[PDB]
Each structure stands twice: as C-alpha cells, then as structure tokens.
Write an enzyme that holds these catalytic residues in place. Sequence first.
Site, PDB file in Angstrom:
ATOM      1  CG  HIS A  63      -1.971  -1.082   1.201  1.00 47.32           C
ATOM      2  ND1 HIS A  63      -3.028  -1.110   0.322  1.00 47.32           N
ATOM      3  CD2 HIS A  63      -2.041  -2.203   1.956  1.00 47.32           C
ATOM      4  CE1 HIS A  63      -3.781  -2.203   0.563  1.00 47.32           C
ATOM      5  NE2 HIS A  63      -3.153  -2.904   1.538  1.00 47.32           N
ATOM      6  CD1 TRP A 121      -4.997   3.162   1.749  1.00 48.69           C
ATOM      7  CD2 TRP A 121      -4.934   4.366   3.652  1.00 48.69           C
ATOM      8  NE1 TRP A 121      -6.083   4.009   1.739  1.00 48.69           N
ATOM      9  CE2 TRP A 121      -6.077   4.742   2.903  1.00 48.69           C
ATOM     10  CE3 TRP A 121      -4.685   5.009   4.890  1.00 48.69           C
ATOM     11  CZ2 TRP A 121      -6.958   5.742   3.358  1.00 48.69           C
ATOM     12  CZ3 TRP A 121      -5.603   5.934   5.384  1.00 48.69           C
ATOM     13  CH2 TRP A 121      -6.699   6.319   4.587  1.00 48.69           C
ATOM     14  CB  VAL A 180     -11.289   9.377  -8.747  1.00 51.19           C
ATOM     15  CG1 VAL A 180     -10.497   9.564 -10.089  1.00 51.19           C
ATOM     16  CG2 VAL A 180     -10.505   9.988  -7.573  1.00 51.19           C
ATOM     17  CG  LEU A 194     -25.902   9.039   6.193  1.00 49.88           C
ATOM     18  CD1 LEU A 194     -26.204  10.515   5.975  1.00 49.88           C
ATOM     19  CD2 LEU A 194     -27.202   8.313   6.515  1.00 49.88           C
TER      20      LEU A 194
HETATM   21  C1  LIG Z   1      -8.033  13.933  10.560  1.00 46.80           C
HETATM   22  C2  LIG Z   1      -8.840  14.034   9.242  1.00 46.80           C
HETATM   23  C3  LIG Z   1      -8.503  12.833   8.316  1.00 46.80           C
HETATM   24  C4  LIG Z   1      -9.375  12.873   7.061  1.00 46.80           C
HETATM   25  C5  LIG Z   1      -9.137  11.714   6.058  1.00 46.80           C
HETATM   26  C6  LIG Z   1      -9.376  10.307   6.677  1.00 46.80           C
HETATM   27  C7  LIG Z   1      -9.179   9.186   5.638  1.00 46.80           C
HETATM   28  C8  LIG Z   1     -10.311   9.062   4.621  1.00 46.80           C
HETATM   29  C9  LIG Z   1     -10.018   7.952   3.618  1.00 46.80           C
HETATM   30  C10 LIG Z   1     -11.103   7.840   2.520  1.00 46.80           C
HETATM   31  C11 LIG Z   1     -12.401   7.182   2.995  1.00 46.80           C
HETATM   32  C12 LIG Z   1     -13.447   7.091   1.883  1.00 46.80           C
HETATM   33  C13 LIG Z   1     -14.809   6.486   2.355  1.00 46.80           C
HETATM   34  C14 LIG Z   1     -15.614   6.252   1.102  1.00 46.80           C
HETATM   35  O1  LIG Z   1     -16.109   7.227   0.486  1.00 46.80           O
HETATM   36  S1  LIG Z   1     -15.871   4.603   0.566  1.00 46.80           S
HETATM   37  C15 LIG Z   1     -16.525   4.891  -1.144  1.00 46.80           C
HETATM   38  C16 LIG Z   1     -15.332   5.040  -2.113  1.00 46.80           C
HETATM   39  N1  LIG Z   1     -15.796   5.425  -3.447  1.00 46.80           N
HETATM   40  C17 LIG Z   1     -15.968   4.576  -4.449  1.00 46.80           C
HETATM   41  O2  LIG Z   1     -15.828   3.363  -4.268  1.00 46.80           O
HETATM   42  C18 LIG Z   1     -16.463   5.163  -5.723  1.00 46.80           C
HETATM   43  C19 LIG Z   1     -15.904   4.445  -6.997  1.00 46.80           C
HETATM   44  N2  LIG Z   1     -14.425   4.455  -7.038  1.00 46.80           N
HETATM   45  C20 LIG Z   1     -13.674   5.519  -7.120  1.00 46.80           C
HETATM   46  O3  LIG Z   1     -14.184   6.635  -7.240  1.00 46.80           O
HETATM   47  C21 LIG Z   1     -12.185   5.306  -7.092  1.00 46.80           C
HETATM   48  O4  LIG Z   1     -11.905   3.946  -7.408  1.00 46.80           O
HETATM   49  C22 LIG Z   1     -11.557   5.690  -5.688  1.00 46.80           C
HETATM   50  C23 LIG Z   1     -11.717   7.205  -5.424  1.00 46.80           C
HETATM   51  C24 LIG Z   1     -12.211   4.912  -4.520  1.00 46.80           C
HETATM   52  C25 LIG Z   1     -10.094   5.380  -5.644  1.00 46.80           C
HETATM   53  O5  LIG Z   1      -9.457   6.043  -6.803  1.00 46.80           O
HETATM   54  P1  LIG Z   1      -8.612   5.159  -7.890  1.00 46.80           P
HETATM   55  O6  LIG Z   1      -9.219   3.820  -8.031  1.00 46.80           O
HETATM   56  O7  LIG Z   1      -8.536   5.986  -9.054  1.00 46.80           O
HETATM   57  O8  LIG Z   1      -7.181   4.924  -7.204  1.00 46.80           O
HETATM   58  P2  LIG Z   1      -5.940   5.975  -7.040  1.00 46.80           P
HETATM   59  O9  LIG Z   1      -4.871   5.560  -8.004  1.00 46.80           O
HETATM   60  O10 LIG Z   1      -6.405   7.345  -7.158  1.00 46.80           O
HETATM   61  O11 LIG Z   1      -5.552   5.677  -5.529  1.00 46.80           O
HETATM   62  C26 LIG Z   1      -5.248   4.351  -5.133  1.00 46.80           C
HETATM   63  C27 LIG Z   1      -5.098   4.343  -3.619  1.00 46.80           C
HETATM   64  O12 LIG Z   1      -6.464   4.525  -3.075  1.00 46.80           O
HETATM   65  C28 LIG Z   1      -6.744   3.527  -2.111  1.00 46.80           C
HETATM   66  N3  LIG Z   1      -8.206   3.369  -2.058  1.00 46.80           N
HETATM   67  C29 LIG Z   1      -9.005   2.748  -2.974  1.00 46.80           C
HETATM   68  N4  LIG Z   1     -10.296   2.784  -2.613  1.00 46.80           N
HETATM   69  C30 LIG Z   1     -10.294   3.406  -1.372  1.00 46.80           C
HETATM   70  C31 LIG Z   1     -11.305   3.739  -0.464  1.00 46.80           C
HETATM   71  N5  LIG Z   1     -12.632   3.408  -0.657  1.00 46.80           N
HETATM   72  N6  LIG Z   1     -11.001   4.417   0.637  1.00 46.80           N
HETATM   73  C32 LIG Z   1      -9.707   4.736   0.901  1.00 46.80           C
HETATM   74  N7  LIG Z   1      -8.674   4.427   0.091  1.00 46.80           N
HETATM   75  C33 LIG Z   1      -9.000   3.777  -1.058  1.00 46.80           C
HETATM   76  C34 LIG Z   1      -6.001   2.295  -2.636  1.00 46.80           C
HETATM   77  O13 LIG Z   1      -5.906   1.311  -1.632  1.00 46.80           O
HETATM   78  C35 LIG Z   1      -4.684   2.986  -3.067  1.00 46.80           C
HETATM   79  O14 LIG Z   1      -3.858   3.192  -1.913  1.00 46.80           O
HETATM   80  P3  LIG Z   1      -2.631   2.141  -1.663  1.00 46.80           P
HETATM   81  O15 LIG Z   1      -3.280   0.774  -1.521  1.00 46.80           O
HETATM   82  O16 LIG Z   1      -1.813   2.263  -2.889  1.00 46.80           O
HETATM   83  O17 LIG Z   1      -1.988   2.560  -0.423  1.00 46.80           O
HETATM   84  C1  LIG Z   2     -21.453  -3.555  -0.190  1.00 44.44           C
HETATM   85  N1  LIG Z   2     -21.571  -2.082   0.132  1.00 44.44           N
HETATM   86  C2  LIG Z   2     -20.423  -1.344   0.496  1.00 44.44           C
HETATM   87  C3  LIG Z   2     -19.986  -0.512  -0.761  1.00 44.44           C
HETATM   88  C4  LIG Z   2     -19.100   0.599  -0.459  1.00 44.44           C
HETATM   89  N2  LIG Z   2     -18.356   1.443  -0.139  1.00 44.44           N
HETATM   90  C5  LIG Z   2     -22.836  -1.548   0.138  1.00 44.44           C
HETATM   91  N3  LIG Z   2     -22.838  -0.239   0.521  1.00 44.44           N
HETATM   92  C6  LIG Z   2     -24.051   0.370   0.621  1.00 44.44           C
HETATM   93  N4  LIG Z   2     -23.942   1.688   1.016  1.00 44.44           N
HETATM   94  C7  LIG Z   2     -25.108   2.566   0.920  1.00 44.44           C
HETATM   95  C8  LIG Z   2     -22.640   2.258   1.541  1.00 44.44           C
HETATM   96  C9  LIG Z   2     -21.990   3.157   0.461  1.00 44.44           C
HETATM   97  C10 LIG Z   2     -20.687   3.780   1.040  1.00 44.44           C
HETATM   98  N5  LIG Z   2     -20.968   4.494   2.317  1.00 44.44           N
HETATM   99  C11 LIG Z   2     -21.604   3.662   3.352  1.00 44.44           C
HETATM  100  C12 LIG Z   2     -22.919   3.029   2.836  1.00 44.44           C
HETATM  101  N6  LIG Z   2     -25.249  -0.164   0.330  1.00 44.44           N
HETATM  102  C13 LIG Z   2     -25.240  -1.499  -0.078  1.00 44.44           C
HETATM  103  C14 LIG Z   2     -26.401  -2.212  -0.473  1.00 44.44           C
HETATM  104  C15 LIG Z   2     -25.881  -3.528  -0.874  1.00 44.44           C
HETATM  105  S1  LIG Z   2     -24.306  -3.760  -0.759  1.00 44.44           S
HETATM  106  C16 LIG Z   2     -24.037  -2.139  -0.168  1.00 44.44           C
HETATM  107 MG   LIG Z   3      -6.624   8.326  -9.797  1.00 43.39          MG
END
Ligand SMILES: CCCCCCCCCCCCCC(=O)SCCNC(=O)CCNC(=O)[C@H](O)C(C)(C)COP(=O)(O)OP(=O)(O)OC[C@H]1O[C@@H](n2cnc3c(N)ncnc32)[C@H](O)[C@@H]1OP(=O)(O)O
Ligand SMILES: CN(CCC#N)c1nc(N(C)C2CCNCC2)nc2ccsc12
Ligand SMILES: [Mg+2]
Length: 411
Positions: free
Chosen positions: A2, A5, A161, A411
Amino acid sequence: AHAFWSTQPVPQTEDETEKIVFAGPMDEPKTVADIPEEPYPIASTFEWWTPNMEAADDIHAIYELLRDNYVEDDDSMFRFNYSEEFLQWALCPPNYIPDWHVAVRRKADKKLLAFIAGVPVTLRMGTPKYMKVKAQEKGEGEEAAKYDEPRHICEINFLCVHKQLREKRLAPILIKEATRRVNRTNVWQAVYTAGVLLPTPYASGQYFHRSLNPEKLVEIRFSGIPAQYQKFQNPMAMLKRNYQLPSAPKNSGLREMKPSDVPQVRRILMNYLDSFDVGPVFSDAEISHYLLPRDGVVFTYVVENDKKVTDFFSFYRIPSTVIGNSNYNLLNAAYVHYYAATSIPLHQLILDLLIVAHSRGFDVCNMVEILDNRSFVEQLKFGAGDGHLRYYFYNWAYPKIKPSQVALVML
Ligand SMILES: CCCCCCCCCCCCCC(=O)SCCNC(=O)CCNC(=O)[C@H](O)C(C)(C)COP(=O)(O)OP(=O)(O)OC[C@H]1O[C@@H](n2cnc3c(N)ncnc32)[C@H](O)[C@@H]1OP(=O)(O)O
Ligand SMILES: CN(CCC#N)c1nc(N(C)C2CCNCC2)nc2ccsc12
Ligand SMILES: [Mg+2]
Ligand SMILES: CN(CCC#N)c1nc(N(C)C2CCNCC2)nc2ccsc12
C-alpha cells in the site's frame, strides 16, 4: 503493498490491531500552526474547488459526478444514485464546515473530476467494555479511561474519482488535502467506512437485505430464486407470497415524528446508544436534522400511546441506477437508520418499518449487522448479502470490536 496507506497514521496489520489494548492517537501531537497554510500541491492542469453544498447548482454538479462515477457492483449492474436532496442533508448538518467539502476540477474548462467530503460528528470512541475489564485486571484503568470523553471528530464519505481518471493516484491527493483542511480546524481523527478491505478496520459487518418487491428484484438480478422454489408449480407466486406484508402498520399509535418529539426521541436514543462501545452523541439540533422527516430522504415514525413517545424508528432512501435492464431504470432502497424500543420488542417495531417502506414503493430494505439489527433478521426474513461494511479510524488506535458493539450508522 500500500504505497499510500503505509505512509498514514492507521494500524498497518490485523496483527498490530491484535496488540491494541487502549484507545488513543497514533501520530505525535501537532498544532494548527504546524499544518501547511497553502493547499496541497496538484498538477498545473487541475485546481481545488470548494462547492457550496447548500446552493442548488453546486449540489447538482456533485450529484452528477456521483451518479455517473460512484460505487457500483463488480458486474456493473447497479450504481448508487444519491439524490440532490439527500446530499444537502448528509453534508450540511448543524455546525458543518464548508471547507471540508473538497473537489478537483480541470482548470481549462472546469470539468468536475473528483470529490471527498467531511462532516462533524461527536463520537464516543474510548476504550471498549471488554478491554476496560482487561485494564482493571492489570491495574491499568487510568490509561484505559484517558479518552473516554466524547470527541468532536470528522466523518468522511463520498470519495469519488471520475472513471476517466482512475488509477492515477488522485485519491491519495484528495485524502491529503482533506486531512490538511480538517487539521487546520484542530481536528485530528476521522471515522470512515468502505466495502473494500484497507489497512485496517476496527469492526466489520455483513449487509442484510429484506425483499419488498421480489418480482422486480428478480427481474433486475438483485435477487435470485432459491433452488428450493423450483419444486413448486409457480415459483414466482410462492416467492411473492413468502415476502407479502400488511398494507398498514400494526402498532397502535404509530405516527410521523414532529418537532415537539425531539427531546423525548433524543432521550430514548441516547440511553440506548450508550450501551454500545462506539456511537454518536447528538444534540437537539442534530436529532432534528438527522431524524425529522424530509421528503424523498429520511422517514421517521414514533410510537405514541396515551401521549407519551415510547419507541421510534427511522429509515432513509438511496436509489441506484439499474444499468443493464430494459424494464426498470431505478432500484429504490430503504436503509434502516436509528431506532429505539422501550415498550415493544424490536421485531415488532421494525415490522412497521418494512410495512411503511413497502407502502411507499421501496423495493428492498438494507442494513448492516450493527446495533441490535441481528435480533430481528430471521423473523423479519432478512438474508445476508455478499457485501460487507468495514469501519475505520484515521489516527486512532482501537481494539477490534464486534459489529454489534457499533452504533454509528454511515450514510
Ligand atoms: C483527521 C482528518 C482525516 C481525514 C481523512 C481520513 C481518511 C479518509 C479515507 C477515505 C475514505 C473514503 C470512504 C468512502 O467514500 S468509501 C466509497 C469510495 N468510493 C468509491 O468506491 C467510488 C468508486 N471508485 C472511485 O471513485 C475510485 O476507485 C476511488 C476514489 C475509490 C479510488 O481512486 P482510484 O481507483 O482511481 O485509485 P488511485 O490511483 O487514485 O488511488 C489508489 C489508492 O487509493 C486507495 N483506495 C481505494 N479505494 C479506497 C477507499 N474506498 N477508501 C480509501 N482508500 C481507497 C487504494 O488502496 C490505493 O492506496 P494504496 O493501496 O496504494 O496505499
Ligand atoms: C457492499 N456495500 C459497500 C460498498 C461501499 N463502499 C454496500 N454499501 C451500501 N452503502 C449505501 C454504503 C456506500 C458507502 N458508504 C456507506 C454506505 N449499500 C449497499 C447495499 C448492498 S451492498 C451495499
Ligand atoms: Mg486516480
Ligand atoms: C450500488 N448497489 C445497489 C445498492 C442497493 N440496494 C450495489 N448493490 C449491490 N447489491 C444489490 C448486491 C446485493 C447482494 N447480491 C449481489 C448484488 N452490491 C454492490 C456492491 C458495490 S455497490 C453495490
């Protein structure tokens, strides 16, 4: 394994997580003055943008990014379609910080490319009950109690993204910028959830689903028909019968929540949430915001008999786009929110949730096995799905807990 991470203040392995015995911070103490005042660097063709998530048009711009690019299943059948009204509700609770809503746009023509959002939450996140017992057995109670006070932290959600920018390391930059903006407000921990396994969850629960419109669920392939139904002449008729519900609620005195119910709903909710190791603390303002009914978004009912509110439940709506089907465009899902029961068993309260959701045209009811959700699964005919929700902290060491010790709905 990672590249991003491994550089962050999170537990790096399960094993590490297995050594954790007290809640507390991971990183060294820092001040706001130590945090860069300039935005994190980004390539010259991009720019940071702070949307105003109370302004219709900016909400619409974020809504379109998520509609087209947010979470989808692996077979690309369903993609979440959170509504504009839901997004304003979720990201502008009382005392929200506008600067924690972070976007990237392409500078030339302003195409929206990425988003992440933080909101405030007041969270109980001190050492859990089973580990405070260990601490008593060792003479270590003071260290175990150090962080018992509820903490004002950040809840992160809606990381996204654009599909054309995937796998280019943009999500790490989004996360670092959001961390800088949160740290500039003197907040040092966050809570977040994902379906994917990252380093390292403190709790994990399976998703559960309760069919409300099984013919549509089967048509769109959300559901299959268990093999045993093939031993009937009419498998679909028997499936529909299996999941039939009353057409009106059964509990005497069920009605929608109104503003005058906020102090009593706050009292019974907070007494109930207190019993779980991790859970939110809500003010009256936050009870009003998260639980008062909002059309198309959140639905909340109290049981009032003889002028006293004794129980309540809430659910919210998240539709999904049905990507492949020709008969249906949308999947209308109801998700179990907060609840509290003092006068009736929880199964009896939640049956009325299913009845109301079905009457309102929802297709399925979803939940994670948090809270006491396991206590009504079998009687109310929920089944486990293929999905999980994993709970994480940023910059917080925490022992592993069971999902039935989590009281925070995400949510
Ligand atoms: C003190 C305040 C702190 C605040 C911040 C606290 C932390 C918050 C953290 C975020 C909490 C979010 C909560 C939610 O919203 S969970 C919902 C996440 N959204 C989606 O699944 C939507 C569809 N997918 C995408 O939009 C993209 O695939 C995303 C944006 C997810 C990654 O973009 P992409 O696919 O283009 O990849 P990259 O090349 O840019 O980046 C690759 C790196 O990203 C790591 N990665 C992949 N998925 C996740 C994920 N769900 N949480 C954290 N990290 C994730 C991955 O392991 C790798 O790191 P490493 O393995 O190389 O190390
Ligand atoms: C398997 N996952 C996690 C996906 C992610 N991240 C699911 N997430 C949610 N959500 C509404 C999540 C979406 C991300 N934020 C928390 C709720 N609903 C459902 C309904 C069937 S499966 C499933
Ligand atoms: Mg990217
Ligand atoms: C966006 N939605 C629709 C959510 C609802 N209601 C998803 N639905 C499912 N399912 C409906 C599963 C349910 C269990 N069986 C397989 C499909 N899985 C996933 C995984 C990542 S997103 C997503």
